[PDB]
């Protein structure tokens, strides 16, 4: 799995530990080993949500399987929570796009996961 | 809806009010209220289009529905027009990927849209 | 086609000629004129792979067709090889997401490719 956060919250406001926390939290949430979890946080963005420049986030979660209606509800509660507590972003100013990737469509280590 | 623009045009060349203009125009074109509209502009990129580093843009529009042949043609004219007028980018150096998202795959406010 | 590379490798460790090399090798690999190829390299990112901040890359390849099981294995061999030779990133710390885009869903030059 891979989790990307783009946000207008400044770099300095991203707490020590946040990548490692995202990694352990997603490894737990997805049931995948942490060695397979990639995390990417992109602060200081020029972005707006609802027309306002108050803190906000645009995020993506890509996984081969482990993506569905109930699972994504449980991801968004987990992830919004972490962004609220760590980054001080309101859950109603967060978007998370979920992608169920086909193994053949994910390359790694000179090949794909097919 | 969410609209992202990545461009090699420098930050200083993005005119004031550019995020609010995208938000208003995308509310109108999509039928969604400006409240649900997210916009993200990423200048100063290291990027090439056709092997050339003249001004260019790679862009994404995600929406739950409101994506289709005619609508996308209409979005592209809207949006190339704004990048031409506001950022001095030629329309033939713009790519815009459209994504019709399933409601169960968009997270927001601790839940999903399904 | 469009190829995006997000990496924590610093800007100064990206060798001169990289975008042109990527454009040339993707033209060859996808069978498409280099005029249609767009390439985007984002260095200096705050990311982790498998909970390590050693060099890593998260990438995407979008193409209208020329996407599939075998083709994507071949892409991954070519693309990992380049990120290992040029950026000194281990192929097992690279992900590349492949997207077969519908022509209706790729905007360009005020319209779409449909």
Residue numbers in the entry:
A (entry chain B), B (entry chain C), C (entry chain A): 1 to 114
What is the paper's account of this structure, in its own sentences?
To elucidate the role of intersubunit interactions involving Leu46 on the structure and stability of MIF, we compared the structural stability, and biophysical properties of wt, L46A, L46F and L46G mutants at the secondary, tertiary and quaternary structure levels. To understand the role of Leu46 mutations on the three-dimensional structure of MIF, we also determined the crystal structures of L46F, L46A and L46G huMIF at 1.70 Å, 1.70 Å and 1.60 Å, respectively. Static light scattering, in agreement with the analytical ultracentrifugation data, demonstrated that wt, L46F, L46A and L46G exist as stable trimers. Finally, crystallographic data and enzymatic assays do not show any drastic conformational change of the catalytic site or activity of MIF upon Leu46 mutations. Using hydroxyphenylpyruvate as a substrate, we showed that all Leu46 mutants are enzymatically active. In our case, chemical shift measurements demonstrate an extremely high similarity between L46A and L46G huMIF, whereas the L46F mutant exhibits a slightly different chemical shift pattern. Taken together, our data suggest that the intersubunit interactions involving the residue Leu46 play a key role in the structural stability of MIF and provide new insights into the role of a novel intersubunit hydrophobic pocket in modulating MIF’s conformation, stability, and potentially its receptor binding and biological activity.
Macrophage Migration Inhibitory Factor (MIF) is a ubiquitous multifunctional protein and a key player in the inflammatory response and innate immunity. MIF has two enzymatic activities: an evolutionarily well conserved keto-enol tautomerase activity and a thiol-protein oxido-reductase activity that is mediated by the C56ALC59 motif.
